[PDB]
Ligand binder design. Structure first.
Ligand code: LLF
Ligand code: LLF
Lengths: 383, 383
């Protein structure tokens, strides 16, 4: 029966396997975390530039609501396409150097709409083995053929692409990777993809806003323009939502065929004003200050761990995995950090290679040097 | 090549076939529509209760931002599960009489996460031929078997279910249908689904908030509790987002397996406060007033069309399709309404049966009797 299927998918879970509970917080974004009325240094949010509490972004969200009300009313293809949506689209495209941008309610929605509209059964998707669940989930549902290349292995990607294919090949990878905060080799990737007449799709959720001149992100930093750029706004922009950046003809194609775009409610115009305000801060001198500060905090932390019995991943992004190895080790560590007021989150098997239990630490430009030193002090004292 | 595939999917579109452009508006939700600086009576938004501009909802969105900032910071399974998300979940579940509710960023996302997590290749989805693109799109991507039953045909549904199936059967339908605003026969549908040991999933996007005691929607009005209820908030709630309503064990199942829930950014807490404020208005005496007014406006309009050479669909929801038949007819009509300050949207083949060119009119409780009379006056004068 259905219940037997549900009770048994549940009942058959291992403990230190993959069971997951949600803890409610009063504040979850930026420097601090408030949980059951206790304040903690937050090293687990994705607010990399501390923009979630920026007063200009807050102000734009508030005044937007006064100007436009809240809900848009419907679809972009009906009466839900607001002048604010269109200004934001235009501002994104100009920023990142594309012809067009189309707004989406979330990155999952944007990654899904693209793949769904663009890939057919004859087609092939070549995706990095470590690509985000949203990319892979969609690629795996797609009727097209999914092939996963070894993380960042451009030789493998090359082989995958050179195999006879009855249609077209889309290559998918991330600008900054979710797990480890490492970058893809975009210049080389693009190079083999053009060699095989494929097109490239980059999800720069973790780089957007946070690196590059004016924060333009991984592609712009690396001098690569893929055919599809997906940026999402719930990380360094400090809000929520996403855009696909692309050419005139593909944006026209997506407007005709992308059902998720055709039939979904557009975002509240006030959310779109808050996104324009965030983009403005990101492109400004204040933008450069925040990115410089986050970089100095990363330097301070990486320097401080040299002395510690932990291993760091190859990241110079806000994402800093701290390899502990033994899961009882990690668990005990994480609970110790928490007891000392540093809120961190422990990642253990099966999520990652047995003996890779890591803390997935995040830093933001809202943090201060003395926070990093506290984290370091705490990592020293117990371990 | 890719470009040939894009240029040719485009180039090979028929005109009065399915080409679509987006018109930017200054205001798209509720009584009025502002476009290129002209005001129009808006008969094309999904703001059925006029709540998009309600001052208590606006106020909650604004003060939310002051209390919690904007972005949540990340996932519900990390530091993005706010006390406000949890109060909203609890308030929804209590309202609609379920054990649990899980929040989603949009209805598409919610319909996708459920189907994806719940349906396997052995399983079957039996969906109403007219189910919304989001339900069908997901059901069609699913590895499970999709079978479409004739609109509201419980005899056909019965046959579909009685066919040998190697797994489980999920029945999917809408509380109020998107296209025509008609209701499904939920009591009978549930009845055959239980007969065949299936479970039922209802998407009540178009009924939620707007009918039922305290606005509880189609299921509650019809005394049916399906196993999955999806409600979305961009229509009568006047905001954006969605929830799945379900049992303890299935919510636990969805928290473990629903990747779209596990790895997506949660909605801004301020958006969630605005949703709680909207639910409060909906459950209140003001709630009943708005629903009574929308009902009186529907009565006035349906009564006024009896005299006119158009045909109405079987709706007593805010959705009122006005059948015109001849597409040149519909087009000319719609452009005439617009020239007379009533913003309506014309739906023609191939979207609907040749000779079914209709205006898809919507009314809301923000409208007044004199708006309906203007629309009627305009429908009379030219036709
Ligand atoms: C973030 F880390 F909290 C969730 N990861 C989300 C993500 C997306 C999804 O977009 P969302 O807007 O959150 O629904 C797309 N790409 C990547 C790399 C990530 O991490
Ligand atoms: C509405 F009419 F503008 C769009 N129709 C959306 C819809 C959904 C999708 O949820 P969304 O929140 O807009 O992404 C799900 N079910 C139905 C019946 C409709 O109409």
């Amino acid at each position: 029966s259905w219940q037997e299927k549900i009770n048994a998918a549940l009942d058959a879970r291992r403990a230190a396997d993959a069971l997951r509970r949600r803890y409610p917080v009063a504040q979850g974004a930026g420097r601090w975390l408030v949980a059951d009325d206790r304040q903690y240094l937050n090293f687990s949010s994705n607010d990399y530039l501390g923009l979630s509490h920026h007063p200009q972004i807050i102000r734009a969200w508030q005044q937007g609501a006064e100007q436009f009300g809240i809900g848009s009313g419907g679809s972009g293809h009906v009466s839900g396409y607001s002048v604010v949506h269109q200004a934001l689209e235009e501002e994104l495209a100009e920023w990142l150097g594309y012809s067009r941008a189309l707004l989406f309610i979330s990155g999952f929605a944007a990654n899904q709409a693209v793949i769904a509209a663009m890939m057919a059964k004859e087609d092939r998707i070549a995706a990095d083995r470590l690509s985000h669940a949203s990319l892979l989930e969609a690629a795996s549902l797609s009727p097209s053929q999914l092939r996963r290349f070894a993380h960042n292995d451009v030789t493998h990607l090359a082989r995958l692409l050179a195999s006879p294919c009855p249609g077209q090949q889309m290559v998918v990878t991330e600008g900054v990777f979710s797990m480890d905060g490492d970058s893809a080799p975009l210049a080389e990737i693009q190079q083999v993809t053009q060699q095989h007449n494929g097109w490239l799709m980059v999800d720069d959720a973790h780089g957007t806003g946070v690196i590059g001149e004016q924060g333009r992100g991984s592609c712009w930093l690396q001098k690569v323009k893929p055919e599809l750029l997906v940026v999402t706004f719930g990380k360094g922009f400090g809000v929520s939502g996403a855009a696909v950046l692309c050419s005139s003809t593909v944006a026209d194609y997506l407007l005709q065929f992308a059902r998720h775009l055709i039939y979904s409610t557009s975002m509240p115009p006030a959310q779109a004003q808050a996104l324009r305000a965030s983009l403005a801060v990101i492109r400004s001198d204040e933008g450069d200050a925040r990115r410089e500060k986050l970089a100095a905090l990363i330097t301070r932390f990486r320097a401080g761990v040299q002395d510690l019995p932990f291993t760091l991943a190859d990241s110079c992004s806000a994402i800093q995995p701290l390899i502990v190895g033994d899961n009882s080790r990690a668990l005990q560590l994480a609970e110790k950090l928490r007891q000392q007021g540093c809120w961190v989150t422990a990642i253990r098997p099966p999520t990652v290679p047995a003996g890779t239990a890591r803390l997935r630490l995040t830093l933001t430009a809202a943090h201060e040097m003395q926070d990093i030193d506290r984290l370091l002090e705490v990592l020293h004292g117990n371990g």
